[PDB]
Design a protein around this ligand. Structure first.
Ligand SMILES: [Mg+2]
Ligand SMILES: [Mg+2]
Ligand SMILES: [Zn+2]
Lengths: 79, 228, 201, 19, 352, 50, 50, 249, 149, 87, 230
RNA sequence: GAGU
């Protein structure tokens, strides 16, 4: 994850999409303060996102799922 | 004198055989000064026991092949070099091994002397293929230090040398390998300090940490002549 | 500039039939080396046309290439960028492996720029290499006679020689090639015989 | 419109296709 | 004010933050690579040796440019696409662009190459660790021909890796290099005397069997050991290392009487100026080859000076030959100018 | 004082640097011998001879 | 491939190509997809090297 | 001097003119770091004048590359000297021969990659002996101009300056000779006149807290360039014809 | 002559000598050529070459940073350097160097504030040099307009 | 700010007048003494805008307190100085 | 364990600068072990005395020239770096030098403090050419270890910054050269056991025997961390 | 003028 990204690339596949997915997750931890799944072990948001993708916890589709889950529950609360 | 002493920081015991040891902080140049001095004593000077002589009945020389045995006599000798033995009382013991039948001969098959401990009893020595095959040998273990080869023993010791006595390289020292790596340390002000990473790998007879203690002890014992 | 991997599969059957390269005498570019990591267009089997050896859309991996040598494949139709049907770019299949990655190219990669850089760089750098250092002049062009090494039957192509007074086969053709057929029959060595050359056999 | 940008650039291209 | 607490903060920020290094000219994409920075006191950038090839960077005063990827996107672009560990193979040809050069090749060549008996010929060693122990103890040369037991790891038809153990007839040096070799590669790859051409194939093999992580660590290891033994070797360049063949002045006087024969045949008005020009150039061109071949036989195999029973022949350990043969530096062409005949020069015309 | 890399010689074909080094050492050798004779204080006659 | 981008139309299609126009081969092939579906006058062309 | 020379060293050093050479042979009457007086021999010495040549030596001065030009005397007091001998060595010359650098003990061998591609491994001993150490002389100037608003002043009185900073400036506003300076320290107390300026409400507030209102001249004092650090060895003042001179000038 | 001089010095004919590693004390495997080479320190001191910049002065019309260490300058990221990022596919790094790093005036300040707020967010716009290009082309009397979405 | 495409076509006399915010009738750049723009000159502030942010030339209208104001006296609109690179 | 300690046998002080020290008996391989480890400490860690500060009256900076003096101030400083001094009691002493007249100023012209020994009195410091020239300076000698440059000392304390004090390099470390040779011992009938002959070359003073004691002390102090702490 |  830190040194070699190959296994993280092998989870998603497209290097280009790996970058977009890990950037969107890292933005969540950077700004939202969304809690990390893997122990940080004193690492930056970018590295945490890559570990999370390597172990197969974060995914474009999974992010989109939790986006509608939380947005729909807030719509429910407003009405 | 503003004596800057190091402190033993980490002992990563990766295995009972292999251990890494970080050490900091060391003043500039003391990384290699302590690193090498220790490495030398640890390899050549740490004392222990090893097979010095072997006598197998029906064996005139090390290049012959015994029937019903997979390994050639040389291959057998090479296994005895690596045989880990602790002798408690005497400095010289002759162990006897008589074994027969279709079996991988292990170190447990040696008749253990009262004060002689075989540290790895499952250690392979020879493979008997024919069931009718029986092997009988007398393994002489002496206590010494460093690495004393048979080539340096035949040239110096030219007293009694009868035909049949197989001479095998004597590996007294129980340190299997040692390397020290020097990386730079970072302190609040001082930025030219160094860290000493020593990787040891013993067989198991002497503990790695205890071997380090003894090596440093021998070094400090030699400095008793230089007063301070 | 514009050329990017746009699609995964153009669904084209098109491709160029590559053949082994034997310039000079030593095999410069082997078929495997020329074809490695290229999509194999059209079910290309072995000599005896009665059983499919290799499939369609299948990236040539090192294992597959090793099998080609055991089977002694003459020539293979391989999917190329030129024969891609993708409009406004090319498909990952027609390109084949990203040589820099060691696997099939990712869609979105800007291939054209990579290509131009790859072609251009050696020239630009070799213009500096044998020139700051370029000193001693060591030319070599004494190609007087061709000597064959492996025994074989002489096979000439596109040649029109005529017997002379001396009793030797004098070639009267410009482009004349000399192959080296083995026992079973396959080209092993190849040379360039010039015009007005004297053939021993 | 390539590499990292291909994701965003195709998302624009569909925004362009649908008005 | 550069306060003490500020350095600790700076140290905190640069961790896991990639920076781009660039060298002019930027001819292919590898002219820019990302690294994780390591803060050093002192004003020069420190570059990794093995990527010197991609940058075409030699430290005769070269300078490089530094760029900070700011955004999270840019950081991940750098770590995933542009990191040096991620970009090994040339995009132009399927070949590893990261390959040991110079001192590294020389060290490994020195270790693997064998010598007649020397210290402790024909010994028998338990592991490559006993071999290392023997060499550093001073009872064996790296070129001692000794039989060692190594356990090589060969990959089977499935994912499972097969292990096999046998007695190999290698030298002490090759045993010690086997320690750098990952499990999975065969022992036979290191068992030959290693040059630059063999080491690249080593890395290629490593890449296709094991994959990226193992190759990266292996490459680093090879660099460390390569330098280390290059320095142990004590390799140097004295003027006695440039060996002139004893038979230069004879070959030259002969070639000089020959050129005189064709000058005399010109003065008789038989041979045209153009024919003589061509035949004088041919005489000298053959003289040059002969002198070069004389130097190279006298230098290549000049260790005709061995032992054990009586006299035996072996490869020369002359420094300049080792340098050229290993592929660390120089070639036979360079050595011709140094020890042999310089040869025929070309005018600015192109004419010789 | 300095450790220079020999791999920067055979390719470069600047063998002047090696001859300079050998002669420089020889020059410094004579220097070290006169230095030794001056430290001993042998005498004018012996220094003159050498 | 980039050298073979363009093509010269010799003979009219169902669009306003007509004789001697040079257009990208991509665009005329996409036109020919819609011609195959609609029939009409097909466009005859020749690929050009540039 | 170079141990391994060619012989051109002497010729280059003497002909370049950077070395002081003797016009006329004789005995040295007076050696000094700053000058050399030689008394000429009777045979060369003209019958008119006293016949004593005085060469004033050029001391630590700036070069075009900011290097240091110094002449050192290479004769002893009361030494017999031949015409056309080197009296004083230029910056890179030893006893009349050319000395461009320094010879030293070199070993050709690989070392742990610290000499990889021409990279050089040097002993701390060389640094300690300060033999490769070099001298660099930089020139900073402070201009007092006449502007539309009025003349600029070279005063030590500058808005917003610590007494730490003003310690090194004299009454006139010029740094003292011999003073060590580093980036941001002020050399010559020079400012440029300023006009009216809408002070942001925060500066209205801040100046109301402190009380120190802005002055006429702004802040354009010459200060040490960032990261350059040195000792002031000399100061020069140019004044025009009729402007009131600084007490320092 | 040089070997003869070496013999007067009691130095070896080879001019190679036995050397010992300072660290270990053991000898190196073979004689090393040792002697005195006359060496020069060139005018190229690292003190004069090292330079570094995050944010500074900007050029007058193009609004991109100035050049040169004497002007506290930004490194030129030139066409060749751009192509490298294009090959890589590194799109945001490239955009960054064209916009928030260079001309984009809104972008640079907004980006700076985001960096101090930890959030490394990209907030790009249009480089000021392109706006100029347009104005220069209309000053030529060629209508160049932006058709929006 | 974000657009889709870019067109180039011939500039009509009429089109050129659309962009223009004033006719320059004088070669004058600035006054030699008050380095301020000359009337209907090449640097005219009355045409291309104010030299300083939200400030007219003669200085009758200052700061955002006077937003889109056109000074009757000098004839300068009080806006951002940014406009001098735009108009 | 066949423990065998060496004993300091001979101290042949060929000169106050040069000394040979033979050492026996050493068990096989300990010759190089101790030889090198000692050589490294002896070169670096050893403490001594050196000129840290200089103050000549009528001198503002080191680059100026003094009248009646052949040497520039820098040349003079370089000579003081090489000045051999032993301080017995205090670790910091300020020596005063007032000299006039047509004379090569030597080290003996410095007013010697009760507990301050000038090891090389003939050491050259400055050449006075004019007879009317008088030179007056205060040389501050401190005791320390290794090499402490003026550049590393102009970026630490500096609470008092007096215009006139000149800071120059002072290599405190006394050891100029050291080499350790190993020859045959021929003791009883051991043969293998050799001897450690260490040839030291130091500046003034630091006593050969005393220096070896200190070097071994530093080594044994570092070994405390590997014995006591595991 | 510095590395190609
Ligand atoms: Mg180079
Ligand atoms: Mg270079
Ligand atoms: Zn107005």
């Amino acid at each position: 994850a830190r040194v070699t990204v190959q296994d993280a690339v092998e989870k998603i596949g497209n290097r280009f999409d790996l970058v977009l997915v890990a950037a969107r997750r890292a933005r969540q931890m950077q700004v939202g303060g969304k809690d990390p799944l893997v122990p940080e072990e004193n690492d930056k948001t970018t590295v945490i996102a890559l570990r999370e993708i390597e172990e197969g916890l974060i995914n474009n589709q999974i992010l989109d799922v939790r986006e509608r889950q939380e947005q729909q529950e807030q719509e429910a609360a407003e009405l | 004198t503003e004596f800057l002493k190091p402190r033993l920081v980490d002992i990563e015991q990766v295995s009972s055989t292999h251990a890494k040891v970080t050490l900091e902080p060391l003043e500039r140049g003391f990384g290699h000064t302590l690193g090498n001095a220790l490495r030398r004593i640890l390899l050549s000077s740490m004392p222990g026991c090893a097979v010095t002589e072997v006598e197998i009945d029906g064996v005139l020389h090390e290049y012959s092949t015994k029937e019903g045995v997979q390994e050639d006599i040389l291959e057998i000798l090479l296994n005895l070099k690596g045989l880990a033995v602790r002798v408690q009382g005497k400095d010289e013991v002759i162990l006897t091994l008589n074994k027969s039948g279709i079996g991988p001969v292990t170190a447990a098959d040696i008749t253990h002397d009262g004060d002689v401990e075989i540290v790895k009893p499952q250690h392979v020595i020879c493979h008997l293929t024919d069931e009718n095959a029986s092997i009988s040998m007398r393994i002489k273990v002496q206590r010494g230090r460093g690495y004393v080869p048979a080539s340096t023993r035949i040239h110096s010791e030219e007293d009694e040398r009868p035909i049949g006595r197989l001479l095998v390289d004597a590996c007294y020292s129980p340190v299997e390998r040692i390397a020290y790596n020097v990386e730079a340390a970072r302190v609040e002000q001082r930025t030219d300090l160094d860290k000493l990473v020593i990787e040891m790998e013993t067989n198991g007879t002497i503990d790695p940490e205890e071997a380090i203690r003894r090596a440093a002890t021998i070094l400090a014992e030699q400095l008793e002549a230089f007063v301070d | 500039q514009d050329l990017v991997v746009t699609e995964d599969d153009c669904g084209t059957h098109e491709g160029i039939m590559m053949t082994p390269v034997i310039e000079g005498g030593d095999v410069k570019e082997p078929l495997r080396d020329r074809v490695l990591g290229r999509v194999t267009a059209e079910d290309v089997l072995k000599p005896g046309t009665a059983d499919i050896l290799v499939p369609r859309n299948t990236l040539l991996h090192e294992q597959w290439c090793d099998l080609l040598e055991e089977n002694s494949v003459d020539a293979v139709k391989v999917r190329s960028v030129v024969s891609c049907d993708t409009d406004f770019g090319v498909c990952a299949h027609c390109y084949g492996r990203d040589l820099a990655r060691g696997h099939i190219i990712n869609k979105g990669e800007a291939i054209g720029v990579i290509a131009a850089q790859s072609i251009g760089e050696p020239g630009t750098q070799l213009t500096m290499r044998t020139f700051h250092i370029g000193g001693a002049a060591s030319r070599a062009a004494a190609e007087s006679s061709i000597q064959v090494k492996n025994k074989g039957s002489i096979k000439l192509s596109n040649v029109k020689s005529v017997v002379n007074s001396s009793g030797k086969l004098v070639i009267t053709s410009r482009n004349t090639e000399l192959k080296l057929i083995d026992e079973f029959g396959r080209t092993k060595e190849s040379y360039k015989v010039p015009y007005g050359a004297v053939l021993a056999k | 419109p390539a590499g990292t940008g291909y994701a965003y650039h195709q998302d624009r291209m569909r925004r362009r296709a649908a008005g | 004010r550069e306060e003490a607490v500020v350095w600790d903060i700076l140290d905190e920020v640069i961790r896991e933050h990639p920076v781009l290094l660039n060298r002019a000219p930027t001819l292919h994409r590898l002219g820019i690579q990302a690294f994780e920075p390591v803060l050093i006191e002192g004003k020069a950038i420190q570059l990794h040796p093995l990527v010197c090839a991609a940058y075409n960077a030699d430290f005769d005063g070269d300078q490089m440019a530094v760029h900070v990827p700011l955004t999270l996107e840019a950081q991940l672009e750098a770590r995933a696409l542009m990191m040096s560990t991620n970009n090994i193979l040339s995009p132009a040809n399927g070949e590893p662009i990261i390959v040991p050069s110079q001192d590294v090749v020389l060290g490994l060549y020195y270790m693997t190459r064998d010598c007649v008996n020397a210290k402790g010929e024909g010994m028998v060693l338990t592991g490559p660790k006993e071999a290392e122990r023997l060499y550093r103890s001073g009872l064996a040369s790296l070129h001692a021909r000794v039989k060692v037991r190594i356990t090589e790891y060969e990959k089977d038809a499935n994912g499972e890796l097969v292990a096999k153990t046998s007695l190999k007839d290698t030298t002490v040096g090759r045993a010690i290099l086997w320690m750098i070799v990952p499990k999975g590669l065969p022992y036979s790859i290191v068992n030959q005397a290693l040059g630059k051409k063999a080491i690249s194939k080593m890395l290629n093999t490593c890449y296709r069997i094991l994959g990226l992580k193992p190759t990266v660590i292996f490459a680093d290891q090879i660099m460390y050991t390569g330098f280390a033994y290059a320095a142990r070797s004590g390799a140097s360049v004295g003027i006695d290392d440039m060996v002139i063949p004893e038979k230069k002045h004879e070959i030259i006087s002969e070639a000089e009487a020959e050129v005189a024969e064709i000058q005399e045949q010109f003065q008789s008005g038989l041979v045209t100026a153009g024919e003589r020009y061509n035949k004088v150039i041919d005489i000298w061109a053959a003289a040059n080859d002969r002198v070069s071949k004389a130097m190279m036989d006298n230098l290549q195999t000049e260790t005709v000076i061995n032992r054990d029973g009586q006299e035996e022949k072996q490869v020369s350990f002359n420094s300049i030959y080792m340098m050229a043969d290993s592929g660390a530096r120089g070639s036979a062409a360079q050595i011709r100018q140094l020890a042999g005949m310089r040869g025929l020069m070309a005018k600015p015309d192109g004419s010789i | 004082d300095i450790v220079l890399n020999p791999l920067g010689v055979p390719s470069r074909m600047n063998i002047g640097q090696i001859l300079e080094t050998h002669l420089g050492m020889a020059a410094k050798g004579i220097g070290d011998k006169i230095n030794a004779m001056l430290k001993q204080q042998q005498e004018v006659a012996k220094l003159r001879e050498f | 491939r980039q050298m073979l981008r363009k093509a010269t139309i010799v003979n009219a299609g169902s669009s306003d190509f007509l004789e001697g126009e040079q257009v990208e081969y991509s665009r005329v092939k996409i036109a020919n997809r819609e011609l195959e579906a609609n029939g009409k006058v097909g466009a005859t062309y020749s690929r050009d090297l540039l | 001097k170079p141990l391994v020379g060619t012989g051109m060293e002497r010729a280059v050093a003497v002909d370049s003119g950077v070395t002081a050479v003797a016009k006329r042979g004789g005995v040295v009457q007076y050696v000094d770091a700053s000058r050399i007086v030689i008394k000429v021999n009777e045979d060369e010495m003209y019958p008119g004048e006293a016949g004593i040549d005085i060469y004033n030596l050029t001391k630590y001065t700036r070069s075009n590359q900011n290097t240091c030009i110094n002449q050192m005397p290479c004769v002893s007091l009361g030494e017999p000297v031949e015409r056309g001998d080197v009296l004083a060595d230029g910056p890179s010359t030893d006893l009349g021969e050319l000395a461009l650098g320094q010879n030293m003990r070199v070993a050709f061998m690989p070392w742990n990659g610290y000499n990889f591609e021409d990279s050089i491994l040097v002993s701390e001993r060389v640094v300690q002996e300060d033999r490769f150490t070099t001298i660099h002389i930089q020139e900073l100037a402070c201009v007092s101009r006449d502007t539309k608003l009025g003349p600029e002043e070279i005063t030590a009185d500058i808005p917003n300056v610590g007494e730490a900073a003003l310690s090194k400036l004299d009454e006139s506003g010029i740094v003292y000779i011999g003073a060590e300076v580093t980036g941001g320290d002020i050399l010559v107390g020079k400012v440029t006149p300023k006009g009216e300026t809408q002070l942001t409400p925060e500066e209205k507030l801040l100046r109301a807290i402190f009380g120190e209102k802005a002055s006429d001249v702004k802040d354009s004092s010459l200060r040490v360039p960032n990261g350059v650090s040195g000792t002031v060895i000399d100061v020069q003042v140019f004044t025009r014809d009729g402007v009131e001179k600084d007490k320092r000038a | 002559e040089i070997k003869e001089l070496l013999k007067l010095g009691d130095l070896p004919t080879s001019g190679q000598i036995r050397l010992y590693d300072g660290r270990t004390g053991e000898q190196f495997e073979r004689p090393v050529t040792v002697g005195y080479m006359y060496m020069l320190k060139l005018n190229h001191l690292v003190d004069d070459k090292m330079h570094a910049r995050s944010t500074g002065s900007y050029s007058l019309v193009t609004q991109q940073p100035l050049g040169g260490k004497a002007q506290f300058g930004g490194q030129r990221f030139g066409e060749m350097e751009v192509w490298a990022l294009e090959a890589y596919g590194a799109a945001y790094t490239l955009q960054e160097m064209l916009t928030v790093k260079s001309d984009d005036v809104n972008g640079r300040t907004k980006m700076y504030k985001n960096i101090v707020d930890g959030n490394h967010q990209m907030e790009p716009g249009m480089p000021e040099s392109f706006n100029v290009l347009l104005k220069e082309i209309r000053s030529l009397g060629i209508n160049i307009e932006l058709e929006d979405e | 700010e974000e657009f889709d495409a870019i067109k180039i076509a011939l500039a009509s006399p009429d089109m050129i007048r659309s962009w223009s915010f004033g006719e320059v009738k004088k070669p004058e750049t600035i006054n030699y003494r008050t380095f301020k723009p000359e009337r209907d000159g090449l640097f005219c502030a009355r045409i291309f805008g104010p030299v300083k942010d939200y400030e007219c030339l003669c200085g009758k209208y200052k700061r955002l307190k006077h937003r889109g104001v056109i000074c009757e006296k000098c004839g300068v609109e009080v806006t951002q100085t940014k406009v001098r690179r735009e108009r």
